[PDB]
Amino acid sequence: MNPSTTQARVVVDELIRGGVRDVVLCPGSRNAPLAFALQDADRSGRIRLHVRIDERTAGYLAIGLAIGAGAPVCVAMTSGTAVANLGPAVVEANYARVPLIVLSANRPYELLGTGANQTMEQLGYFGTQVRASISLGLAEDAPERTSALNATWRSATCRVLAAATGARTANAGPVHFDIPLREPLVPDPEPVTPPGRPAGKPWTYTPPVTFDQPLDIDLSVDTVVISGHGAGVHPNLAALPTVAEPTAPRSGDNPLHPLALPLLRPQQVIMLGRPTLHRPVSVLLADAEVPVFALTTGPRWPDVSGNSQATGTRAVTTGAPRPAWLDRCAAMNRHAIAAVREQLAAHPLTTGLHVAAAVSHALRPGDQLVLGASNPVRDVALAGLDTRGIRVRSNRGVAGIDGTVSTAIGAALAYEGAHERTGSPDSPPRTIALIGDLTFVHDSSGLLIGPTEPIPRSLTIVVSNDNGSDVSSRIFGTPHDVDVGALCRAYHVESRQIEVDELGPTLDQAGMRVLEVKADRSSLRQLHAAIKAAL
Amino acid sequence: NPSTTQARVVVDELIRGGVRDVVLCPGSRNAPLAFALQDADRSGRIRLHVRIDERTAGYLAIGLAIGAGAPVCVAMTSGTAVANLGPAVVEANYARVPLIVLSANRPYELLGTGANQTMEQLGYFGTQVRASISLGLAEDAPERTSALNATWRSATCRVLAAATGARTANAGPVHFDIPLREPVTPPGRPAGKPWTYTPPVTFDQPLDIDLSVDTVVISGHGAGVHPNLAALPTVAEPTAPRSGDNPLHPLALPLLRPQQVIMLGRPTLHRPVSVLLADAEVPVFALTTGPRWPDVSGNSQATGTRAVTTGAPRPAWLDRCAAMNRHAIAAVREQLAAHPLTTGLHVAAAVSHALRPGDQLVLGASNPVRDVALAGLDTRGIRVRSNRGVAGIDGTVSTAIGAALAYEGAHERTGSPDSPPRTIALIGDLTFVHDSSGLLIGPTEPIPRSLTIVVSNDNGGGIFELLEQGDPRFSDVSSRIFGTPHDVDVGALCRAYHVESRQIEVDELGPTLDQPGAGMRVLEVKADRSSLRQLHAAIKAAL
Amino acid sequence: MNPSTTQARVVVDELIRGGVRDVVLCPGSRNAPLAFALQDADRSGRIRLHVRIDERTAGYLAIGLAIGAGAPVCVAMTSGTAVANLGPAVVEANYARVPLIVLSANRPYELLGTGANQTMEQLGYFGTQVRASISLGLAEDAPERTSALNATWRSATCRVLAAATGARTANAGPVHFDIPLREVTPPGRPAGKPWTYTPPVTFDQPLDIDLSVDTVVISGHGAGVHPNLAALPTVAEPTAPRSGDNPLHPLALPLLRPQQVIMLGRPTLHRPVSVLLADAEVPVFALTTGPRWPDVSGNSQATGTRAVTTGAPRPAWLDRCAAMNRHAIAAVREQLAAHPLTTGLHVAAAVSHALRPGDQLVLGASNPVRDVALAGLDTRGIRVRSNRGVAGIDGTVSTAIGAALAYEGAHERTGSPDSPPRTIALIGDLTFVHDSSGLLIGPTEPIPRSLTIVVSNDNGGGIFELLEQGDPRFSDVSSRIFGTPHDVDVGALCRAYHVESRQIEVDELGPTLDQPGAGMRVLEVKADRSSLRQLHAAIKAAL
Ligand SMILES: Cc1ncc(C[n+]2csc(CCOP(=O)(O)OP(=O)(O)O)c2C)c(N)n1
Ligand SMILES: Cc1ncc(C[n+]2csc(CCOP(=O)(O)OP(=O)(O)O)c2C)c(N)n1
Ligand SMILES: C=C(O[C@H]1C=CC=C(C(=O)O)[C@@H]1O)C(=O)O
Ligand SMILES: [Mg+2]
Ligand SMILES: [Mg+2]
Ligand SMILES: [Mg+2]
Secondary structure, eight states: OOHHHHHHHHHHHHHHHTTEEEEEOOOSSSHHHHHHHHHHHHTTTTTTEEEOOOOOHHHHHHHHHHHOOOOEEEEEOOHHHHHHTTHHHHHHHHHHHHEEEEEEEOOOGGGGTTTTTTOOOTTTTTTTSEEEEEEOOOOOGGGGGGHHHHHHHHHHHHHHHHHHHHTTTTOOOOOEEEEOOOSSOOOOOOOOOOOGGGGOSSSSOOOOOOOOOOOEETSSSSSEEEEOBBBBOOOGGGTSSSEEOOTTTOOSBBBBBGGGGSSOOEEEEEEEEEEEOOOHHHHHHHOOSEEEEEEEESSOOSSSSSSSSESSSEEESOOOOHHHHHHHHHHHHHHHHHHHHHHHHTTOOOOHHHHHHHHHHHHTTTOOOEOOOOOOHHHHHHTOOOOOOEEEEEETTOEEEEHHHHHHHHHHHHHHHHHHHHHHSSSOOOOEEEEEEEHHHHGGGOOOTTSSSSSOSEEEEEEEOOOOOOOOGGGSSOOOOOHHHHHHHHHHHHHEOOHHHHHHHHHOOEEEEEEEOOOOSSTHHHHHHHHHHHH | OHHHHHHHHHHHHHHTOOEEEEEEOOOOOOOOTHHHHHHHHHHHHHHHHSSSSSSHHHHHHHHHHHTTTEEEEEEHHHHHHHHHHHHHHHHHHHHHHOOEEEEEOOOOOOOOOOOOOOOOOOOHHHHOOOOOEOOOOOOOOOGGGHOOOOHHHHHHHHHHHHHTTTTOOOOEEEEEEEOOOOOOOOOOOOGGGSSOOOOOOOOOOOEEEETSSSSEEEEEEOOOOOOOTSSEEEOTTTTTTOOOSBBOOGGGGGGOOOOOEEEBBBBOOOOHHHHHOOOSSSOOOEEEEOOOOOOSEEEEEEESSEEEEEEEHHHHHHHHHHHHHHHHHHHHHHHHHOSSSSOOOHHHHHHHHHTTTTTTTOOOHHHHHHHHHHHTOOOOTTTEEEOOTTTSSHHHHHHHHHHHHHHHHHHHHHOOOEEEEEEEEEOOOOOOOOTTGGGGGOOOSSSOOEEEEEEOOSSSSSGGGGGGGGGGGGGTHIIIIOOOOOOOOOOHHHHHHHOEEEEEOHHHHHHHSSSOOEEEEEEEEOOOOOTHHHHHHHHHHHH | HHHHHHHHHHHHHHHHHHHEEEEEOOSSSSSSSSSSHHHHHHHHTTSSSEEESSSSHHHHHHHHHHHHHTOOOEEEEEEEHHHHHHHHHHEEEEEEOOOOOEOOOOOTTTBBBOOOOOOOOOOSSHHOOOSSEOOOOOOOOOOOGHHHHHHHHHHHHHHHHHHHHHHTOOOOOOOOOOOOOOOOOOOOOOGGGGSSSSSOOEEEEEEEEEETTTTTEEEOOOOOGGGGGGTEEEOOTTTTTSSSSOOOOOOGGOOOOOEEEEESSBBOOHHHHHHHHTTTTTTTEOOSSSSSSOOOSSSOOOOEEEEEEOOOOOOOHHHHHHHHHHHHHHHHHHHHHHSSSSSSHHHHHHHHHHTTTTTTEEEOTTHHHHHHHHHHHOTOEEEEEEETTTTTTTHHHHHHHHHHHHHHHHHHHHTSSSOOOOOEEEEHHHHHHTTGGGGGGTTTOOOOOOOEEEEEEEESSSSGGGSGGGGGGHHHHHIIIIIIIOOOOHHHHHHHHHEEEEEEOOHHHHHHHHHHSSEEEEEEEEOOOHHHHHHHHHHHHHO
């Protein structure tokens, strides 16, 4: 067995032992050793392989596969700009703390600077965006060194997995795993792979760390909880008035609408996760006089407030909220919900806010909701969606528009896969995505799934199409006019154009499909004005 | 505002430096130099191109630079901009493309405490750019305006010189930061001159070479023109300029025993070229411009910039090379005619026969750039572009679009309204799907008048049929992981972007190309890769 | 007041609230970041400032000040050579996890990248070595935003401190903190509290371990204290804290067959240790704090932070280890007694016997740190320091000086009358010559009160006598390129710098150390390395 084939099979086996259930693969020749070993593992049923053509959107597919079920996910590609194309997903995975392993094949490092084809400064390309930049050695033809090389290869693979899942740091994120490879790149004619640990165990076992930092907080002070992306679950704060972003997990049943917050005067703030969504949240955390307490699941804590008194992972609570304060916040929340609902009905034309409210009402527990990181996530929060029992995904790391379609497809695939391991047909759970037309058009090639590749069993993408100071904004002066139906036809995906009233019934009833709901953009500044005035 | 004055000085000096096109993307904050660029665009001193896709924007800028050889600016204005521009910047480094990346830091804001909307840095700027220059923050000091104007225009000329290789002969990408505090132009030199003028430079490294020794010339990407080598048998890549009129077909090379090799530029094509270059019994002389020389095996005897020649090739050696060249040409022509199914090689031959002088030819990676060489294209009189720096299949649509725009722009300024010269791109289907978003161009934005993109579509990566993983013993496992079939409806995709497109057979390709159409159009030719490996085998057996 | 002046004190006040007691500065072309605010706090006794001319020794002085009492230390860059000269100290701070804050001041109103930079001339190591890189904004003249700026500045300074001390990461290390400049101090928290408080954190990773299996504990740099492991036979490096009472000598390890290993922290010494850790039939469990784990061989079975033990070591196993422990120690001492020439090993044992609880011991690399382990030093009650992060022989003099000052300062604020506790440094002769400039301390500058530097001078590098290049077959060539004799007059060297020094024999050492002297003194013991390979051979024969 030639060295490239031996090394690739060892790495793939150790990744599987580490909990990697899904791998994204992009075509090339230099990554052939990885592609062969990955195809074997898929044939054996040890992993599910997903082949894609465009490395950039393939990275967001891997992000979706990771956030859908919480497992580390590898994306593998050839040397050169294929690696550079993972840049956007790596940045998103860094700030959203997604265990994304970039498994890049490379020419031998000795060829760097020789003019060799398709070769570049690959290792270190991602800078400080990755949790680690790790290189295997070039595989030596040293059969007597086989046992030693098996240990070092599997150990390096375990270092990669630990860094990506945050097993020791509690700060999951992307990892660059560069593997220099040389000829022969394809397996030899048959006419054994060095084995891992017994019982399928990982070569170096590192259990998931428990990161703990308790913090004293007195709940008698009029307190509001603001929870953002990556927030933990705190039972002892469940009673408090909580402004929760759609991707934050709910700890209780005392919601406070984001619009209600600037109309109240909290005397202290408990901040969970990384809240970046709302402008009244940004405004209040900008107020240097309001003391803030930051509770995070990991060592990072957000910089959105300059008055963070302390950090922790959990609250040690004394006291209890004033009943008058609870009554006041509850009243203002009811008031904000009513204002939004009244103005929506009093608005004749369909807006993206209407589409978002319709999608919000159509959801039922067990659904997974994937939200475009710009308008959809804001609109759903404006419509006051109740996320309890719903799994809400959104690329809130840097909130780019790249890869939103691929992230939805990947999250559905991973979510449906976690259902299969339960044991049951009761049918696979629903994944519903809400994406704007510009985001959808930009990542429409994320729809492309080859005839041989896994297709989501129950994914519906709702496209809210409203047809779209510096000079670059002239691009928005005109509706783009892109035919969404033609786009879906191009990538052989079923699509239907429907009205908002039809959306709920149609979501009740194709595999993967796109439902396009036309909406109007002109009348919205007035609609938001009406909502604000009705508060 | 001092920052508005500084921005106007910089744009003016960039225009004096030959910048004709700037690429922008809508962003989290305003673009660097945003208003000065808008002022210049309205005046017609410069031309702005706006895109939503930041990755395709980078490759658009590369095309705008290689189309006519001018420095091009791209202004990065978002938290994903550095990540998305990576591919184009790397290609600009390795293909030596004068690409100026504009940024606008905010010295009054914090850095390193969290996500940065203005710039999220990766690690490639340290390795890829020729220079990283930051202007000062512009201060209000009316009494120092002459000194500041001199400082700003001097630094701008440094950015331009580093990007174009004015003094280094090593063009490449440059990072140019004009910082901002958020939230009559001092003149330049008389007669539109650049503030700091860089007159022509020569790097001279002559090498003594005896041409009576049986010699072949291999000319790759970035090769120079050597009149004293014009008589030699020459295996020229499509992007190499031709010194002479003695072509040697790539497939004829293994049928020969060269005694020495002159290597011009950077070779990226053909395993027989790589084998010959590594042969320790064959002296190799590398003639290239710039700091580094290509030598994968380490076998090269000497490197320089030009040859001082004695002797001449033996007529028998020239006859032998001409005879094997004839065999190779005949084998390709005869086996293509004998082959029933249309392949990408068929499409490449059709494109080659249809070109004429003045055409610009843009070649995608994979089989197209190789197939054009196998079809024996005569590149004299035409300009051939291809992103051979890293040979990516990403961004080729915007590269072709940018190349057409810059090429048409240079022609309009000559002043003869003969119709704009043609740009014809030949790319594979995977290459097309990779960069299909480059077809999305707003009516506000410049659009080519004479660009035709030929997509040879064999529903996958045909080159992998020709490699070791294309051997029949991998036939059960190779379709998914190397073939990567996709079943995309190309006509529908072009419909969605409102781009004229036709699906035609290889015989109609020539006539359809002879007759113009919309400013941009996509001609799709269905092709087969199932017979590809056999076809190349039949060609080799006919040599 | 100038906004920069306000910002500078806000930062210095928050640094002092963060436990910074010492700051190291060097004279540069530009004055130091926060220079006046540091001057103010020095005069008021809020911090102690240390000035050095040598920028390299200044960085290692800062490391000593940090490891002496565990406090974060700031070092202010001021020149065009500071980055390069601080490199070695930053790399050691990274690998030894030392909280070192590197202060810089970029000037955003000036140009960058056109050449010519006088306050930070960058290298490539900052990206790889630091825990964070933070830049305050430029101070902006907006008195209506005074309270908001105060919060932003104190919040960012706490980020810097938390990253340096590992307050939330348990991964202390160096941090780059830039306060940019341009050519009634707002209050912090009440009661001297830091602006952002970080309560204690725990990283918990329990591993099930069966102590009935024959287990040896090996503890290296950065090892934790594990009570449930105190009974096990333990080979503890000198800088490792002892969890218990059952020592196992390093030389006994080859005479034993552990069936599993518990590794604490990072082992760097002893080939038998490395051999055992790499044994594929021996399960290895790594218990260490922080993001990474040591495993050169890739052999380790599991990593974590603590053990969940079942069972107890077999009495037969315990007795065998105790037996070979006693045997190993006896062999070292008998062979040292039999040996007729003073070697570094003799000096190590002498210093070892002279130590008493409350002492601080600073060990150079090479033979000193190893010899002390071979002399069986019982480190309980002793603070042992050594630059094991990357194990350079550079900067050890200033590390000891800084560690002494921090240790004496910590003792002083207990307020006690009691002689400031002792710091005893044991370093080789090359190590001493390497960092001899660390002796040069201005009368203005803080100077230790209880520091004795013992130099075991064998006129070269003794450790090479014990390696493969020490084999007699290399005798003709090995002295020049490995021994590197220098013939320096060490007494004249200390006299040039006005430092007390005595050249004494090894019998005098214990008595001389027992007796107090000048604040800083050097005792030099001449040693022989010609017989060192033989002596080590004699010790192993006695096993
Ligand atoms: C960004 C990038 N990803 C992957 C590759 C590897 N690669 C080289 S050729 C090729 C096949 C391209 O297929 P197509 O464009 O259809 O051309 P064909 O060979 O089929 O004519 C691939 C995936 C690359 N060069 N660049
Ligand atoms: C800066 C640096 N240079 C070189 C080395 C390599 N090195 C390791 S031990 C050693 C010899 C040290 O000699 P000495 O300080 O006299 O101690 P001895 O072993 O002689 O007791 C050298 C040069 C190093 N560790 N650091
Ligand atoms: C041209 C060859 O492979 C190239 C073409 C496609 C994919 C490649 C890759 O991804 O490594 C190779 O660069 C060859 O080996 O002859
Ligand atoms: Mg829209
Ligand atoms: Mg193809
Ligand atoms: Mg010595």
